[PDB]
Amino acid sequence: DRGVSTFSPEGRLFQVEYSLEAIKLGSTAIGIATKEGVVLGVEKRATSPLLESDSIEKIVEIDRHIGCAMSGLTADARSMIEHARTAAVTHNLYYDEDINVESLTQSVCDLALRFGELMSRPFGVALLIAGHDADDGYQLFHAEPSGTFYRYNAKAIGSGSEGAQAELLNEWHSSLTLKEAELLVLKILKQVMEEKLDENNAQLSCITKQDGFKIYDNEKTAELIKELKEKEAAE
Amino acid sequence: TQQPIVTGTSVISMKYDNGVIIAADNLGSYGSLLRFNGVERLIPVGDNTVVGISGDISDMQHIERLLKDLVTENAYDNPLADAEEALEPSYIFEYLATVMYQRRSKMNPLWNAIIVAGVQSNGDQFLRYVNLLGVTYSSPTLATGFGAHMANPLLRKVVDRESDIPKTTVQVAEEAIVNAMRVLYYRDARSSRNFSLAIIDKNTGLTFKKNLQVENMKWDFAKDIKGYGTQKI
Amino acid sequence: GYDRALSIFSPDGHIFQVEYALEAVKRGTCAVGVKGKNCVVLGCERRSTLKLQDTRITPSKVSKIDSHVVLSFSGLNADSRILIEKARVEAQSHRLTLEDPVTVEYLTRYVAGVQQRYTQSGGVRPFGVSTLIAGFDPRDDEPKLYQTEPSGIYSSWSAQTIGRNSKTVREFLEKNYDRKEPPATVEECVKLTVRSLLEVVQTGAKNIEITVVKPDSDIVALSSEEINQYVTQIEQEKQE
Amino acid sequence: TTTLAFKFQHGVIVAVDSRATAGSYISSLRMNKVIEINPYLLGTMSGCAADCQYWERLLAKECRLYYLRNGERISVSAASKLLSNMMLQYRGMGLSMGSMICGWDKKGPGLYYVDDNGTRLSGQMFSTGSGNTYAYGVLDSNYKWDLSVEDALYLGKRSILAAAHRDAYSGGSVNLYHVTEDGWIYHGNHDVGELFWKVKEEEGSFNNVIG
Amino acid sequence: GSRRYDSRTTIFSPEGRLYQVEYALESISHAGTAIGIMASDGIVLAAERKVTSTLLEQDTSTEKLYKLNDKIAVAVAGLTADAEILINTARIHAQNYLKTYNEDIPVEILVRRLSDIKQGYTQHGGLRPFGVSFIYAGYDDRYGYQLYTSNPSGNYTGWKAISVGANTSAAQTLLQMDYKDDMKVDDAIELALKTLSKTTDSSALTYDRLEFATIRKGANDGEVYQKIFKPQEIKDILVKTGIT
Amino acid sequence: QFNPYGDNGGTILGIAGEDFAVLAGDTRNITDYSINSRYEPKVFDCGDNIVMSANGFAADGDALVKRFKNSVKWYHFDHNDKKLSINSAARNIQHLLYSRRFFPYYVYNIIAGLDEDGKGAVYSFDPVGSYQREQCRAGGAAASLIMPFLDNQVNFKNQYEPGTNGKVKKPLKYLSVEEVIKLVRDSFTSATERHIQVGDGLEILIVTKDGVRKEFYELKRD
Amino acid sequence: NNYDGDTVTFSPTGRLFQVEYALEAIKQGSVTVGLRSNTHAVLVALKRNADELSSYQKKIIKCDEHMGLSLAGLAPDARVLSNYLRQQCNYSSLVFNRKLAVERAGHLLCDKAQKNTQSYGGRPYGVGLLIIGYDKSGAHLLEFQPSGNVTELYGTAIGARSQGAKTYLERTLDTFIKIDGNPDELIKAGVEAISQSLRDESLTVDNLSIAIVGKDTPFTIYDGEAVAKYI
Amino acid sequence: MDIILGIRVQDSVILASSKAVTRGISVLKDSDDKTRQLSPHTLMSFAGEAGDTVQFAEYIQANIQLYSIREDYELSPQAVSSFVRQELAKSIRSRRPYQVNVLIGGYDKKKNKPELYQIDYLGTKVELPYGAHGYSGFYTFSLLDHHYRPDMTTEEGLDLLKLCVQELEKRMPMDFKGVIVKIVDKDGIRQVDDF
Numbered sequence A: 001d002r003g004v005s006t007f008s009p010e011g012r013l014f015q016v017e018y019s020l021e022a023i024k025l026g027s028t029a030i031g032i033a034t035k036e037g038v039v040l041g042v043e044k045r046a047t048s049p050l051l052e053s054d055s056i057e058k059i060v061e062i063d064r065h066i067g068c069a070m071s072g073l074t075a076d077a078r079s080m081i082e083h084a085r086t087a088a089v090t091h092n093l094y095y096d097e098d099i100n101v102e103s104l105t106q107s108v109c110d111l112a113l114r115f116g117e118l119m120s121r122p123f124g125v126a127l128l129i130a131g132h133d134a135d136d137g138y139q140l141f142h143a144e145p146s147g148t149f150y151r152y153n154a155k156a157i158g159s160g161s162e163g164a165q166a167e168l169l170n171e172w173h174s175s176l177t178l179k180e181a182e183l184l185v186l187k188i189l190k191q192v193m194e195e196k197l198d199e200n201n202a203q204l205s206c207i208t209k210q211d212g213f214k215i216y217d218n219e220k221t222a223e224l225i226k227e228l229k230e231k232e233a234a235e
Numbered sequence B: 001t002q003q004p005i006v007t008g009t010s011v012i013s014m015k016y017d018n019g020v021i022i023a024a025d026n027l028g029s030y031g032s033l034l035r036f037n038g039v040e041r042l043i044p045v046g047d048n049t050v051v052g053i054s055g056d057i058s059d060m061q062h063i064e065r066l067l068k069d070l071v072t073e074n075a076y077d078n079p080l081a082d083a084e085e086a087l088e089p090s091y092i093f094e095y096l097a098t099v100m101y102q103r104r105s106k107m108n109p110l111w112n113a114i115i116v117a118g119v120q121s122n123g124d125q126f127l128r129y130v131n132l133l134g135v136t137y138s139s140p141t142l143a144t145g146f147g148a149h150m151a152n153p154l155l156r157k158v159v160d161r162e163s164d165i166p167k168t169t170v171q172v173a174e175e176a177i178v179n180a181m182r183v184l185y186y187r188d189a190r191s192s193r194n195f196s197l198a199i200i201d202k203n204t205g206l207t208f209k210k211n212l213q214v215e216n217m218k219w220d221f222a223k224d225i226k227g228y229g230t231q232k233i
Numbered sequence C: 001g002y003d004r005a006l007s008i009f010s011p012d013g014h015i016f017q018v019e020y021a022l023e024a025v026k027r028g029t030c031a032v033g034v035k036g037k038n039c040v041v042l043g044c045e046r047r048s049t050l051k052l053q054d055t056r057i058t059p060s061k062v063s064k065i066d067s068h069v070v071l072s073f074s075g076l077n078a079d080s081r082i083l084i085e086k087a088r089v090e091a092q093s094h095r096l097t098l099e100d101p102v103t104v105e106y107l108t109r110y111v112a113g114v115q116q117r118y119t120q121s122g123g124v125r126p127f128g129v130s131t132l133i134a135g136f137d138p139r140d141d142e143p144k145l146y147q148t149e150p151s152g153i154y155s156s157w158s159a160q161t162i163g164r165n166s167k168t169v170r171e172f173l174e175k176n177y178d179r180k181e182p183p184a185t186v187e188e189c190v191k192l193t194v195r196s197l198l199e200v201v202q203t204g205a206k207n208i209e210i211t212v213v214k215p216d217s218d219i220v221a222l223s224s225e226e227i228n229q230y231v232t233q234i235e236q237e238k239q240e
Numbered sequence D: 001t002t003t004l005a006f007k008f009q010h011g012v013i014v015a016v017d018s019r020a021t022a023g024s025y026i027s028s029l030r031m032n033k034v035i036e037i038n039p040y041l042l043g044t045m046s047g048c049a050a051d052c053q054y055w056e057r058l059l060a061k062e063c064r065l066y067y068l069r070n071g072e073r074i075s076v077s078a079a080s081k082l083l084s085n086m087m088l089q090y091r092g093m094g095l096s097m098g099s100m101i102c103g104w105d106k107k108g109p110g111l112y113y114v115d116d117n118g119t120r121l122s123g124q125m126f127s128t129g130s131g132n133t134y135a136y137g138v139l140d141s142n143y144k145w146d147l148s149v150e151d152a153l154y155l156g157k158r159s160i161l162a163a164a165h166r167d168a169y170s171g172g173s174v175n176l177y178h179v180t181e182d183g184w185i186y187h188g189n190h191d192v193g194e195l196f197w198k199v200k201e202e203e204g205s206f207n208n209v210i211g
Numbered sequence E: 001g002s003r004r005y006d007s008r009t010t011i012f013s014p015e016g017r018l019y020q021v022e023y024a025l026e027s028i029s030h031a032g033t034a035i036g037i038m039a040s041d042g043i044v045l046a047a048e049r050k051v052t053s054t055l056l057e058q059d060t061s062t063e064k065l066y067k068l069n070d071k072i073a074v075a076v077a078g079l080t081a082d083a084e085i086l087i088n089t090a091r092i093h094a095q096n097y098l099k100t101y102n103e104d105i106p107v108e109i110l111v112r113r114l115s116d117i118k119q120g121y122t123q124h125g126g127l128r129p130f131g132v133s134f135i136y137a138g139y140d141d142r143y144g145y146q147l148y149t150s151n152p153s154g155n156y157t158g159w160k161a162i163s164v165g166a167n168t169s170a171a172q173t174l175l176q177m178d179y180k181d182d183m184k185v186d187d188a189i190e191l192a193l194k195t196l197s198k199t200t201d202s203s204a205l206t207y208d209r210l211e212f213a214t215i216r217k218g219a220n221d222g223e224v225y226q227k228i229f230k231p232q233e234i235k236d237i238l239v240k241t242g243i244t
Numbered sequence F: 001q002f003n004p005y006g007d008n009g010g011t012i013l014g015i016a017g018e019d020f021a022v023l024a025g026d027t028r029n030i031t032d033y034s035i036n037s038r039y040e041p042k043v044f045d046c047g048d049n050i051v052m053s054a055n056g057f058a059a060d061g062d063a064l065v066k067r068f069k070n071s072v073k074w075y076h077f078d079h080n081d082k083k084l085s086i087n088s089a090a091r092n093i094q095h096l097l098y099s100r101r102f103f104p105y106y107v108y109n110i111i112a113g114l115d116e117d118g119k120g121a122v123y124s125f126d127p128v129g130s131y132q133r134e135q136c137r138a139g140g141a142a143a144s145l146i147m148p149f150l151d152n153q154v155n156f157k158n159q160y161e162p163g164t165n166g167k168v169k170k171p172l173k174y175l176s177v178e179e180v181i182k183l184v185r186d187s188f189t190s191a192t193e194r195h196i197q198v199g200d201g202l203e204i205l206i207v208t209k210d211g212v213r214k215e216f217y218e219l220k221r222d
Numbered sequence G: 001n002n003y004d005g006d007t008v009t010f011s012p013t014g015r016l017f018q019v020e021y022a023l024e025a026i027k028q029g030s031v032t033v034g035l036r037s038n039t040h041a042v043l044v045a046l047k048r049n050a051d052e053l054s055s056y057q058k059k060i061i062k063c064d065e066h067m068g069l070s071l072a073g074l075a076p077d078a079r080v081l082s083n084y085l086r087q088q089c090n091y092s093s094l095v096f097n098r099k100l101a102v103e104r105a106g107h108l109l110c111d112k113a114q115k116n117t118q119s120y121g122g123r124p125y126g127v128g129l130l131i132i133g134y135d136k137s138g139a140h141l142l143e144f145q146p147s148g149n150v151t152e153l154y155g156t157a158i159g160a161r162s163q164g165a166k167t168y169l170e171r172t173l174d175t176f177i178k179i180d181g182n183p184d185e186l187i188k189a190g191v192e193a194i195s196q197s198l199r200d201e202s203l204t205v206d207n208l209s210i211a212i213v214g215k216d217t218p219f220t221i222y223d224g225e226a227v228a229k230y231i
Numbered sequence H: 001m002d003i004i005l006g007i008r009v010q011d012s013v014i015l016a017s018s019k020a021v022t023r024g025i026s027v028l029k030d031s032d033d034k035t036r037q038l039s040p041h042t043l044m045s046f047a048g049e050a051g052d053t054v055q056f057a058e059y060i061q062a063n064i065q066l067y068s069i070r071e072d073y074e075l076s077p078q079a080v081s082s083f084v085r086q087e088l089a090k091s092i093r094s095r096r097p098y099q100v101n102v103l104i105g106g107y108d109k110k111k112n113k114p115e116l117y118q119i120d121y122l123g124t125k126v127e128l129p130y131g132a133h134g135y136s137g138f139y140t141f142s143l144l145d146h147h148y149r150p151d152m153t154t155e156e157g158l159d160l161l162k163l164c165v166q167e168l169e170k171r172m173p174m175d176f177k178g179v180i181v182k183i184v185d186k187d188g189i190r191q192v193d194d195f
């Protein structure tokens, strides 16, 4: 056939490029970074009404100061999360401190290119890693299966990404509040989702310095959806 | 873990104003038997370093080969091997010190005590000790085995501290080393009359003296000594 | 060792070997899982192409992983034994290191992790098996029902079916199963499970297996006659 | 050392001394022999200080990972067992550790004794170290389930004092802890020199000593 | 490199089948028919040797029926060489169980072990599967008399009566017709031979073209005897049942 | 039989001030009754405003310092030039020591610097990695000579206020850098008098927010 | 064509296509410039962003106090290679108490990249590196290609549109080599060199990345408002 | 640990095991249960070096429970005792052997018979009507030799066991803090809460 670590004539790794196509098929995940915190939101996308939607866990805690959202082949993410959690806690063991968000992200990305003929293929999932540390403050990273990671003020991944990213281009500014960011994620999720957005098929979360990483209740999100509807009807 | 078989005794050394001196006798002992009388225990590395070794001779010969190989390896893909990127005394020492400590950590030591004497690029004097345990130290004077007990006291009368080094000439330093070697011949039962001496100067370079002998020895007073107390005849 | 990467991405972003493993599941006999208010029922199809079978000794479709958790499947039979064995070992290993039995969610997560590992490991092919894992957590009266699949994704279900003609029985369950009021009793839960299989099975004789799991390690398999009574009552109400 | 811990109606008391010795030389006057694994978990230290610190700080890593994986606090029973299994890997290698894993979980308050041999014991009351015999004397005669938080804190404090006095390898100060269902609560560092004289006068005990 | 020449023996087809398993089954369909029939008082194993010669030494020959232990035997259909590899492994597993628990291995446990080995060759290793299908005839004190079959897929099932190898479709129909639950060994012997006599590709069924075995409680009091039939004994049972 | 360990003597001393910290040690290196060197540095500036000294078996001490210095280097590489705090360094050293739980670094280790609030800090280790933050600590050959003196003259132990007769303690007033250096010099001068492995010289490293400063003082050479 | 499936296959004209394809990844990468005098050595790198919300990917990596590099191509491969250099620089210090020569560092990178071009299963590195440093023989600049070829130069540039900066340096050769004891003027020449490779976009405050090493100057990186001086 | 006794009567097996656990010179616990249920009708008591005892017992327990689930069937006491013996015989030539002595009491539901097996740390197995480990047999076997009948009731077996414990309490130098008694019969395993 052909090697798994083969370069294309354009200078790209075939397998890495193909894994990016799998991520485009995944459910939407959005992250917005502000000076009051970072918000993470996802589309749950249940395949059937009999599937209990609260069991869909696409937002995940890595540490008290680091959260993570996923998009693509979500089964691949479990070992990445396991490594991330281990790295975060192991550093706390060795250095008696919280680990930097960038350093955590870098540790996750070091797994990415460990494939060949190590694992047999790259990961088929992208991660939005959001967190806070004392040195660089509130941060949002986009971790790909290429091993590359970019920091973002705001970022969308998944099937509705380029449409959402264009929207985030216009809406984001450096003075956004946390409440404003929450509504903004809900707004853009509602825009790119197939089914009608509600508290059961979408999920919010945030990371603040005070309270740390929190996944929002369905009752809490429902109120933010109702607040969104009214403010859009206001003009 | 082993025991030393064929052994070499004291190696002594000191700093002076423009460089360093090092010396060691030419004997290879087999316990109390003075088996081998033509053993060179000072080994030059380039024209700026001399490594003096005491202890097990088979391990000495091993180290001698590591050094010979080190020079070979440094020349590889190195246009400045006889100039800027030549081996320094500090490089050679740290290498040996690394090996000695690793070997003791595997419980299979090189049963030696080594003194690396040389002059650096910037003209600074280098003199440092290392042994089978990987223990390292530096001082204006350094000596191994018996030399530590007998030679250091004599050499420290010349250079007692760092500020005495510029005041010490090469003639004075050599004189002190040669006297120390005579004292060791009087008092060390595993020493020999024949020895080698090396001077590494920042101006005149490396001078390697072989086939030296202890001379001007005092024995005449022995004729008057009779018995062990009460005997007169 | 044999290191060849068998599960790989294709230009369109698909892992064909994982998708072809789902086709093996589609070929497998139908399995269904329904959870009531205080129980979970696991139904399983037995294809009647094989008669002269010895039903005493033939491997049953539902397998106990521990005293409080069961596992049924659809797909390659030989593959399912490997997952079941690994699951059973992990169940005893968890009891041994943590002093509590596994939660149904944990056991599912482990089995799904095994399936995932076989999609990005060299020299191996994915498991041609999807599973339904059901039971009750220790000292808990809330029913648990989970599904896994070759890719390694897993999720919880109020009711779910897998295997051949699972599209049809899922259609039935989606219109018949009310979340606000689930099957209150064991009878209602079994009746709904048999009804759902009768949409696909053919004859209601030895083709339907039912296994009821209640809280506190109360697991029993219904017999032919007991199931046959459900089959009789359903069709007599249907003649109207 | 002397350490103790006991369950009672209002949770569990944990009291330790603070002395560290290197032979007959008192190397440390004030050493922390309690580890704060999590808000609801404590660990005592007796034996080799290095072994106690390393392995219990490593247990806290494993307990934290448990919370991340399961979204739920580890039980005292499970925590104690992880630690005993660590000791079992270095079976006969020369580790010296004697600890009590104290906490509150879903079964209520929990207390487990764990040592370098791999021994893991559940119980209401334990005491470890060179002065454990002196502490057990006070504990056994005065312990009740019906103790008040104030009286229980004193009992553990007084029990360490008894040992600090008689045992030459116990002393320095007393560190107190009280574990509730809202977590552990530190009840201060108490110098034995000052505490001894105070208790002597107020209680009337230690009559044989002059002051 | 070496990838160029790799057949990839452990992959799915687009339809979700294992290529090599399916082709191995095709191989087995050309092998001599083997039949197993379970009765209330014993089990019968009958099998047809493939186009033999007059110069073949039959009395010292064994290609179909093999002994795993005193309680369990197997009939083979496929590559004999492949079967012997597996048979020797099974014999060892039985002895390991006996050494460990001091009890004879239950039939199903032995069957599952062999079937798990076959399964392994279909999922990992990159090697071709074993081109063998077994009929297991055995007894233990839990389930009594038992018949099982396993194939290259590693899947196994229990049976009252079953055939493997050539013409199983025809053979299974004939067995399904004449088999009854209250049947006895002597009757099952007759059924097995009659079925082979009708499904055989040969002109006539003779003693030299057959291997035969029974597992009976027809052993003095509560115990089980294995009988591998000799050439002369197969010749006698053929006359008794009225085939020759 | 081969003995992989040795004793190079020496003695070290760390004292934590209110906004500073000192780590002192003699410069004498010995084996048995011989002097190897009268000036062999033992206290090192390890970077990030941290000073360190591993006293006991010099070969193991030099290796540990070398490895920690290396650990600081890789901490910068791996974590975007972040400053290694004194508490983080301490925990890192614990793990370096425990790597050899079954073939220990035969050294008593002390480090000194400033905590993240700018206050003075001293951390003390045993050979197998037990550590703890302290205000005052002497280590090595003459540790038992010096510590009691520091209990008395730094923490005012057994000292009470005149007139009250044991009722009121001496209040714990803070010490200046000039006052600390006096106590350090007297500690080593006293140790030199009664311990044969202590002498020749005294090198003190002082740590403040401004950086790391050195001071050297002669000791008796007998 | 038929001979580009793996790195273990020569074409009929003696070419290694997988290596050539890895070389192509460098050309797609953002431009970076290297140049030196007798006292100092400078790296200048144009950083690239994903979009306006994203950060600008870092291009320069520190290897030791006296050595570092800039990258162009697959960033993860640069991390692997720079990590290797860090270890080799570090092995030289710990064992020999010797700062690793820049020339020897190049020889080590060459040999590491080569092994990936001759063996089955692996792949070539997909990144180009510009290594600067100051050792016992003064200032140095190296160019690394993942074919294995390492070249010591006075100045150079790699990445997209790198030919413009390379021509400029070829003209300015006699001028910038003489810039001794003046770090700011040497950086100016580097900033003016990389400017010859720009189209549409210009050098902004979070776009530009500069690094320097010299006689009494440790390897330091300048980003953010620290490079506003040179815009 | 110290004392573990066992007696097989007409229709059951009775195991008695001491409650004490000692570290150094102090008795840490006086209510320790030195036993594990391997299966519903099989019980194993144990005594030996600290730590090893429980690990080994729990390791055996896990293996038998795994077998039970896999086959949906309870192994005979004889089969279990043979498995345990093999693990110990395997262990004795290991780098670091497990220093554990056991008694296995079980009721064979097939044969409808109680069975008692005694196995020491070397892997020395013997089926007995009554057994013990360590020094316990030195004091008790004389009484059992005298009073034991195979047709004894469970109540008679407990009375004879009380007599054995009374003799141990009189002539043993060590205080073992009484015993926990458990009965194994057709109906399963139960503990005698008053003894």
Ligand SMILES: *[C@@](C)(CO)[C@](*)(O)[C@H](Cc1ccccc1)NC(=O)[C@H](Cc1ccc(OC)cc1)NC(=O)[C@H](C)NC(=O)C1=CC2=CCC=CC2=C1C
Binding pocket: D001, D002, D019, D020, D021, D022, D023, D027, D031, D032, D033, D045, D046, D047, D048, D049, D050, D052, D096, D129, D130, D169, D170, F104, F126, F127, F128, F130
């Ligand atoms: C009580 C004081 C009994 O002596 C009590 O057990 C304390 C407990 C404790 C717990 C947590 C922190 C501090 C103290 N035990 C000690 O202080 C302990 C007693 C002990 C000493 C030595 C060993 O063997 C190593 C076991 C127990 N003391 C120490 O751990 C002291 C700090 N260790 C050493 O002095 C020591 C010297 C030494 C030389 C070479 C290798 C290791 C060495 C150690 C640990």
Ligand SMILES: [Mg+2]
Binding pocket: F191, F192, F193, F194, F195, F196, F197, F198, F199, F220, F222
């Ligand atoms: Mg002195």
